[PDB]
Design a protein around this nucleic acid. Structure first.
Ligand SMILES: Nc1ncnc2c1ncn2[C@@H]1O[C@H](COP(=O)(O)OP(=O)(O)NP(=O)(O)O)[C@@H](O)[C@H]1O
Ligand code: SF4
Ligand SMILES: [Mg+2]
Lengths: 802, 911
DNA sequence: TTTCTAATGCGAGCATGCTCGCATTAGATTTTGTT
């Protein structure tokens, strides 16, 4: 066997530091390794794996690596594979197995389901094949529902609540006695009887106990169809692992080292699914290392409880090893990434410090301009330097308020700003054409086609078209007359009638009548296709339109030949939804609209580019990416702390009470002593339940700060757009000002004193008015009179001749 | 060896591609016409073998060429001197076994099909490996695994109830029954061309030995290395070895044999057939598909090798993501019940309704959009209107009822073209009634002319006619089956040259010239999928099959064995006779190449490409015209691309010339609406025209999704309030409420209760505010010029007018909403300002008063201060400016608070 | 034509200081996951 340092130097890599020495030299046994942010994870992982496989404690086929997200799992798999392969050179057939948690739970079910009454061949639901079903069971439910809420807005509560029952393992049978304890107490200053506010809270509890039958109906409906969601899946795996020990015995026999990578972002459904299998009281020979960071928990407290949950099986807790030396700038790590101390890191590469700059402006436009100017001068200085390419990026809290940053940077920089699949103008036209084909009474589609680039129309032609469409109606008060109108049958005025029976050619412009005739011929061609299978009809529509060629005809010569990936992914989604319980050329559009409403379109192709682009991505996303200088623009009163969208367990009918939330991380509302006593006791519990929301923003802010690879330009605006009051700088900035001004390491800029704000509006005349024109003239001159294009063209024409 | 009058038994073997399959043909031809038996392995192989032998041979008699299962069936036939029904038996047996009180750990699992399928697999494997149920019970007693002995006793119970995969097991004892029946066939058949012995079952192996005790001659042929699917080709019997490929190239054979080194493993490719092996990669799941399409198209069109000589041998079609992307580039690809198929379903519904004798309305529409009489949506919208002119009704009649009555008797009001679209239905629904005494289905088929149309659609959509005819022929075959076995019928039926993508297992009979082994992914091709379950079938099958593992359940339920997985790829490459291509992907963001990609790269001839070239016109032109319109790169290739686009557009290929280019299309008019004038502005219209004139145009004209249900209930409440006593209104609302489309039955009642409360709030407010305001008129129209030189002449309808207590005129308007507007925006409300303007200019009958703007929901109100000439002039100026804005082209598109629900949002330029 | 929930500043109700309905206005937080 070999020691860590000797084993490392036998390979081609640097000697691991002392921090990366203890964990590698750690003996096989359940241990947790708190790895700091930037401290070099997913490399110590491979170091530990290669240490074990070299000293001979376990062969490669017995290693197992679990990681929360797919990309991180792929990274770990690649690193482990290359390390194991390289070790074969210096003193084979099998390889590691790496899986994201839910994939492991899926495999566990498919291998041991029948020990439970769980089908193995259960389809898994996206977030839009579910909603389109949980909105069916709520529609068909027979009863009263004394709720005073629109359907498709109690479906939201049913989904949210049933997405937490299957996370804290409650199974809806014990969530029926939760309101008697509080109602009896509230029913038994001024002697008015219980206050108006108090009854409101009780109403929510009664409403939740009224939803219970809806929650139970949905589960049986999914059992009948052999269909299961992510939450129900992981909960089933947890129940199986907890109940049956032979599965754990099997899995511990097969796997001798397990790599729980991202263990601070996993909830109570997996904390018990993964201790019961291996770590409960099992053999100490299994390695069981877990590298979490307890401060950066964006998604959503298992780390503080890992010890006494994965013990030595004699009743003794597990070790704990740390990782520091974050490979980060001193100024961010020192005095700044200590923004949240709340623990009751060091400058690693002894590299050159960096500037950190704050600013209080007097306008969102002003702060946007300031950040834009700083990033722009940093980018342009690279050009004079000889292409330094700082490739910065801005971290923004809200998903909105990042589009105008593209406006403020495209003047000088070149951003990417990493729109759903159904907002790309290559696909939206395809969806609109499908809609106009399938159902005529869609004005929001007839306009998208009549004013689209393929043939623009003028106001006069649209008005004449609608004139004919209303003249063709010819329909002549009473209540029965009103209700008879607006049935699924009754007819109205719709533009899609004029396009088919235009009438006299005099009313339309002489150029605009030919377009109407051509569109009519096109639509009458396509409307014969509705009998065809849906995945073929979609491609036929795409071929008839020019989308396939034009989506490429607008693309930099830099990118090779791409452009059609969005179309092809959409046609993939179509080819997946179809052949599935129904062709449904008109129930596809219901799927597409439901997808637009929930999950914000779909997942695009996510094209990657390698320029010196300034990314405009969101702070909540992109964890683990540490690239360059970053800036967080908005730190005002209500944007970053975001503490307004707080709905606690006593008002939102779709949140589990603390007394029942198997986490019990929050306070449980003792309420054992006894109305003014109680009325005060609730507000204290709410305030305590509010500080958790704040504690969930430090972690966002700490994650944002700890991405500062080069320098920071954090800032805070004032007098946000479209409001009346100043909305001064929030928390996270005043304290940030203080922590900056007591050191070497911040600079203060413009610090606008706190004071009628902007009312300027945005406009764009409709019918819009060059390289394309010059190229067209060039092509025309060519008609008048390398990459191998000549041979390709000759081959295509030889095909055409036939 | 292998000659007339030779020994009783001889062994034949050799590497893949050798002449073994066709070698055996010659010795059959030279040899009685009978006494020769050829056992191939599949009926698809039988076609080729019999075709070769017979075409190599007027009085020639077909040699008996069959399969092992078929031969066992024929043996049982002489001894006489399906999975669906199987699963039904097994599931009902388990349901019965659940009655009384298996190791009891899995009692809950018995009701499930998941256990039935695994039990089916266990029994099938046991039968294929030839182990009696009593023997398996003995195994379950010896090895302390209760589930095994339980399954053995279950198999014993199963075989009790009988006395398609047990034919060999039956025949094995069927031969031993007589012990003279053996001699009958041993003296009948002399040759016994049993072939492809690597694919034989251990039970079927025993039958071959039994038939080859000794007589005449027998031949066994097959490579004893690609056994993956366990043969025993080891004896002192005479052996013939073949070592010249005759199919694969020596470059290909090099790679295959190099693979086989780490596993007669030696053989060399045909020297004449020069070829190569190429290993490629891709940077995404789509790059692989498009580059496979690229390579296939180039091979077809530049290298001359056609379709039907190419293939994509992938791991196993779960796969499906490849046929699509491979067809999109224009590459033909080879390869849902009659109930689902629409053409069959339409005629099925015709038959159903004919048998029933009564046609519901909701089933007459469903065959206007079908293929029997086909109507598109904007012709249904002509039928609806035309029929509702036949009998004008104050509330229009339901379209289903109108259609069914029209079908059964034709109203001839409009009937211009719609005479035929109903005549087809007349003919079919009558000729179906004509017989009423099967044959009626054919009569219905003939009555409609769709047969002639479809058979005249042999052009271009022409594929759809072929599919539809396939479906209808299948339906006719089912009808014949039922006639030889009509309300009992409807529920009876309720229950070439092209690249051929196919899985590796089915791709063991390919003579292809160009194999593309897609999907050599790491988690796919070397499978890490656990083989275990609950019954331990995988761990039992190897203990049962020899001593592959002792009585330990340790190595079986881990993953498929690599040595058993590399043979697949080794045999897969062997199919390619000229060129191979192993394609894998590796992308940074979720995918890696297998441990086999690197090894194959050793013997291969030659930054994975991220956006590969394609050869298809809609791609090539979109590349060419993409460089000519470049800001500045490719200065002379720009001219080359211009010339190439000229050549392209000289013939066709839509998208080349700037006429077809989208960004070159020109607006039609660019001319004002009413350049001439007086323009009418209803009070609601002005409230959108002061915000977003583009919204005014594109929504008030044609862009509105159309008449939601919260809009007609509001107007219904308006109408109920209008007429001139709360107790009588509720019973007007109740009777009419039931014909309202709501999604949820429980929602209808809640909305009805809320709106009843809304009417009650209205009456409470009315009787409250009669103390100072008196109603001059209700639902009074407004019409008359107000400002004019362009004039506006507001026209509209007023909700309710009131005369103030001291010489004034207060105008109100009831809204049925929940969310009132602020008290400063309701001071500048465009609608109420317009009403006060109309009042001030007379035309109602006279001074400006307030505007109450009463909200019935929840009764809050937001008043407006009565006008003054100081303000009235400004409002007149605003109205004039709006009227001017209506005219000119290029309407402004301002953004405002309401810009979050306007139906025209997917087309405004401000977004 | 149309809206959830809540935080705000009154403003009478009664043991000057709260105190609690009552009416009026601002915003609609972000993605991670199967074959
Ligand atoms: N001596 C030969 N001369 C010319 N052509 C031959 C000769 N032997 C075989 N072939 C050709 O090779 C083709 C392939 O048939 P054959 O090789 O007999 O199948 P097979 O290789 O045995 N199947 P496999 O198990 O993959 O080896 C035949 O159709 C013949 O046309
Ligand atoms: S979204 Fe705004 S700018 Fe666009 S049409 Fe609607 S109101 Fe006008
Ligand atoms: Mg009204």
């Amino acid at each position: 066997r070999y020691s860590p340092v000797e084993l490392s130097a036998a390979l081609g890599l640097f000697p691991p530091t002392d921090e990366q020495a203890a964990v590698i030299a750690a003996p096989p046994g359940p241990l947790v390794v708190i790895a700091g942010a930037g401290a070099g994870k997913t490399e110590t992982m491979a170091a530990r794996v290669v240490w074990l496989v070299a000293n001979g404690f376990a062969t490669p086929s017995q290693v197992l690596g679990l990681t929360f997200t797919r990309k991180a799992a792929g990274q770990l798999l690649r690193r482990v594979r290359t390390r194991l392969a390289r070790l074969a050179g210096a003193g084979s057939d099998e390889s590691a197995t790496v899986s994201t948690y839910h994939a492991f739970a899926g495999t566990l079910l498919r291998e041991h389901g029948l020990l439970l009454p769980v089908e193995p061949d259960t389809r898994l639901l996206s977030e839009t094949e579910l909603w389109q079903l949980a909105y069916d069971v709520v529609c068909a439910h027979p009863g009263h529902l004394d709720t005073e809420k629109t359907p498709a807005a109690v479906t939201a509560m049913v989904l949210r609540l049933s997405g937490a029952l299957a996370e804290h393992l409650v199974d809806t049978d014990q969530l029926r006695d939760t309101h008697v304890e509080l109602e009896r107490l509230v029913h038994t200053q001024r002697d008015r009887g219980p206050s108006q506010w108090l009854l409101r809270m009780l109403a929510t509890q009664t409403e939740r106990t009224e939803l219970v039958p809806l929650i139970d109906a949905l589960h049986q409906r999914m059992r009948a169809e052999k269909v299961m969601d992510f939450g129900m899946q992981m909960a089933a795996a947890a129940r199986l692992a907890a109940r049956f020990p032979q599965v754990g015995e099997q899995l511990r026999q097969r796997f001798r080292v397990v790599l729980l990578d991202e263990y601070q972002d996993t909830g109570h459904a997996q904390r018990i699914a993964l201790s019961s299998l291996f770590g409960g009281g099992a053999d100490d020979g299994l390695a069981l290392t877990a590298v979490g960071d307890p401060i950066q928990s964006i998604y959503g407290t298992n780390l503080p409880r890992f010890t006494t949950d994965f013990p030595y099986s004699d009743g003794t807790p597990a070790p704990t090893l740390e990782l520091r030396t974050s490979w980060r700038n001193p100024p961010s790590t020192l005095h700044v990434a200590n923004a949240v101390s709340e623990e009751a890191l060091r400058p690693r590469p002894d590299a050159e410090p960096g500037t950190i700059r704050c600013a209080l402006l007097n306008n969102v436009a002003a702060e946007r301009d300031w950040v834009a100017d700083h990033l722009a001068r940093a980018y342009h200085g690279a050009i004079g330097r000889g292409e330094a390419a700082p490739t910065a990026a801005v971290l923004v809290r809200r998903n909105a308020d990042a589009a105008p940053m593209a406006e403020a940077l495209t003047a000088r920089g070149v951003p990417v700003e990493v729109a759903g699949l159904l907002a790309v103008p290559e696909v939206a036209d395809l969806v609109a054409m499908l809609r106009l084909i399938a159902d005529p009474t869609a004005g929001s589609a007839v306009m998208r086609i009549l004013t689209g680039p393929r043939w623009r129309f003028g106001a006069r032609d649209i008005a004449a078209l609608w004139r004919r469409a209303v003249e063709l109606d010819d329909r002549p008060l009473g209540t029965a007359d009103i209700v008879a109108q607006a049935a699924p049958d009754a007819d109205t005025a719709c533009v899609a009638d004029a396009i088919c029976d235009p009438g006299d050619a005099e009313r339309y412009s002489p150029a605009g009548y030919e377009r109407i005739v051509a569109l009519g011929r096109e639509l009458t061609m396509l409307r014969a296709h509705l009998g065809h299978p849906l995945p073929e009809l979609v491609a036929e529509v795409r071929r008839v339109l020019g989308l396939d060629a034009e989506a490429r005809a607008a693309r930099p010569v830099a990118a090779g030949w791409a452009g059609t990936e969005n179309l092809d992914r959409f046609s993939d989604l179509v080819s997946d939804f179809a052949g599935h319980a129904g062709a449904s050329v008109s129930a596809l559009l219901a799927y597409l609209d439901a997808a637009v409403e929930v999950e914000n379109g779909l997942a695009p192709a996510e094209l990657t580019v390698s320029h010196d682009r300034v990314q405009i991505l969101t702070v909540h996303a992109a964890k683990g990416l540490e690239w360059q200088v970053v800036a967080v623009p908005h730190l005002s009163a209500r944007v970053f702390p975001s503490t307004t969208q707080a709905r606690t367990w006593l008002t939102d009918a779709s949140d589990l009470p603390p007394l029942l939330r198997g986490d019990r991380a929050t306070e449980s509302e003792i309420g054992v002593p006894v109305r003014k006593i109680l009325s005060d006791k609730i507000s204290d519990h709410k305030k305590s339940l509010d500080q958790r929301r704040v504690d969930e923003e430090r972690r966002l802010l700490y994650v944002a700060i700890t991405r500062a690879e080069d320098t920071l330009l954090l800032s805070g605006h004032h007098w946000g757009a479209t409001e009346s009051k100043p909305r001064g700088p929030s928390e996270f900035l005043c304290e940030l000002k203080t922590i900056l001004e007591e050191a070497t390491c911040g600079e203060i800029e413009h610090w606008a004193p706190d004071p009628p704000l902007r009312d300027q509006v945005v406009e764009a005349l409709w019918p819009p008015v060059d390289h394309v024109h010059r190229g067209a003239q060039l092509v025309a001159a060519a008609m008048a009179g390398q990459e191998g294009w000549a041979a390709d063209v000759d081959a295509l024409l030889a095909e055409r001749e036939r | 060896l292998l000659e007339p009058g030779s020994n009783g038994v001889v062994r034949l073997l050799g590497g893949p591609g050798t002449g073994k399959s066709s070698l055996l043909v010659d010795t059959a031809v030279q040899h009685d016409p009978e006494s020769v038996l050829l056992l191939t392995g599949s009926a698809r192989l039988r076609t080729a073998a019999r075709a070769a032998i017979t075409a190599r041979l007027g009085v020639v008699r077909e040699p008996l060429v069959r399969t092992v299962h078929s031969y066992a069936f024929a043996v049982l036939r002489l001894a006489a001197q399906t999975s669906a029904e199987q699963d039904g038996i097994i599931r009902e047996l388990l349901a019965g076994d659940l009655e009384d009180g298996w190791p009891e750990q899995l009692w809950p699992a018995l009701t499930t099909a998941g256990f039935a399928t695994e039990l089916r697999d266990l029994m099938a494997r046991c039968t294929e490996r030839g182990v009696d149920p009593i023997a398996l019970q003995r195994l379950g007693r010896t090895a302390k695994r209760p589930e095994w002995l339980a399954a053995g006793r279950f198999a014993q119970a199963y075989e009790q109830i009988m006395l398609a995969a047990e034919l060999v097991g039956a025949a094995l004892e069927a031969l031993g029954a007589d012990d003279e029946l053996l001699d009958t066939e041993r003296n009948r058949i002399k040759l016994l061309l049993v072939d492809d012995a690597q694919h034989l079952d251990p039970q079927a192996a025993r039958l071959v030995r039994a038939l080859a005790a000794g007589t005449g001659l027998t031949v066994i042929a097959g490579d004893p290395d690609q056994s993956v699917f366990v043969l025993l080709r080891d004896d002192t019997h005479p052996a013939i070895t073949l070592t010249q490929s005759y199919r694969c190239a020596p470059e290909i054979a090099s790679a295959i044999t190099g693979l086989g080194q780490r596993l007669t493993r030696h053989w060399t490719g045909n020297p004449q057939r020069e070829g190569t092996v190429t290993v490629r990669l891709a940077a995404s799941t789509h790059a692989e598909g498009t580059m496979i399409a690229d390579a296939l198209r180039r091979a077809h069109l530049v290298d001359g090798i056609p379709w039907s000589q190419m293939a994509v041998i992938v791991r196993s079609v779960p796969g499906t993501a490849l046929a699509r992307a491979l067809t999109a580039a224009g590459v033909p690809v080879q390869d849902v019940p009659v109930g689902r198929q629409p053409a069959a379903a339409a005629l099925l519904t015709v038959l159903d309704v004919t048998a029933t004798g009564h046609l519901d309305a909701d089933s007459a529409v469903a065959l206007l959009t079908g293929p029997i009489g086909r109507v598109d949506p904007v012709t249904l919208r002509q039928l609806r209107r035309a029929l509702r002119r036949a009998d004008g009704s104050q509330p229009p009649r339901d379209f289903g009822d109108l259609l069914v009555d029209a079908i059964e008797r034709e109203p001839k009001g409009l009937s211009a073209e719609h005479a035929r679209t109903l005549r087809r239905l007349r003919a079919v629904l009558t000729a179906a009634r004509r017989s009423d005494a099967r044959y009626t289905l054919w009569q219905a088929w003939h009555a409609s002319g769709l047969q002639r149309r479809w058979l005249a659609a042999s052009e271009r959509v022409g594929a759809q006619a072929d599919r539809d005819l396939d479906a209808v022929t299948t339906l006719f075959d089912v009808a014949d089956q039922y006639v030889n076995r009509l309300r009992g019928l409807v529920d009876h039926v309720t229950r070439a040259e092209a690249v051929a993508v196919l899985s590796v297992h089915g791709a063991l009979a390919g003579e292809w010239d160009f194999v593309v082994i897609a999907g050599v992914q790491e988690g796919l091709w070397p499978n890490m999928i656990p083989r275990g379950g609950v019954l331990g079938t995988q761990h039992l099958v190897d203990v049962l099959d020899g001593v592959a593992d002792m009585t330990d359940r340790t190595v079986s339920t881990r993953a498929p064995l690599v040595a058993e997985e590399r043979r697949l790829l080794m045999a897969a490459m062997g199919r390619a006779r000229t060129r191979v291509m192993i394609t894998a992907v590796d992308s940074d963001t979720g995918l890696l190449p297998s441990p086999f990609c690197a090894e194959i790269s050793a013997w291969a001839t030659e930054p994975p490409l991220v956006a590969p070239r394609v050869l298809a016109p809609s791609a090539l032109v979109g590349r060419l015209r993409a460089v000519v319109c470049a800001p500045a790169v490719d200065d002379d290739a720009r001219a080359c691309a211009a010339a190439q686009l000229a050549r392209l557009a000289a013939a066709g290929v839509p998208g080349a010339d700037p006429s077809q280019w989208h960004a070159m299309t020109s607006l039609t008019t660019e001319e004002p609406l009413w350049s001439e004038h007086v323009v009418t502005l209803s009070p609601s219209t002005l409230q959108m025209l002061t915000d977003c004139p583009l919204r005014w145009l594109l929504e008030r004209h044609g862009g509105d999704d159309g008449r939601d249900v919260r809009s007609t209930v509001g107007s219904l409440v308006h109408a109920l309030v209008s007429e001139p006593t709360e107790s009588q209104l509720v019973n007007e609302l109740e009777k009419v409420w039931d014909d309202l489309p709501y999604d949820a039955k429980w929602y209808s009642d809640n909305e009805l209760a809320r709106h009843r409360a809304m009417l009650e709030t209205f009456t409470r407010w009315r009787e409250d505010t009669r103390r100072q305001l008196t109603e001059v008129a209700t639902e009074i129209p407004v019409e008359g010029i107000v400002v004019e030189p362009p004039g506006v002449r507001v026209r509209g309808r007023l909700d309710r007018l009131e005369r103030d207590e001291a010489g004034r005129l207060v105008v109100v308007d009831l809204k049925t909403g929940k969310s009132p507007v602020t008290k400063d925006d309701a001071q500048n409300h465009a609608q109420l300002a317009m009403y006060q303007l109309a009042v001030a200019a007379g035309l109602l009958d006279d001074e400006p008063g307030g505007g109450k703007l009463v909200y019935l929901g929840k009764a809050t109100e937001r008043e407006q201060d009565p006008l003054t000439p100081d303000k009235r002039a400004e409002w007149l100026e605003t109205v004039g400016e709006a009227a001017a804005a209506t005219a000119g082209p290029r309407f402004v598109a301002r953004v405002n608070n309401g810009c979050a629900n306007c139906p025209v949002r997917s087309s405004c330029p401000a977004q």
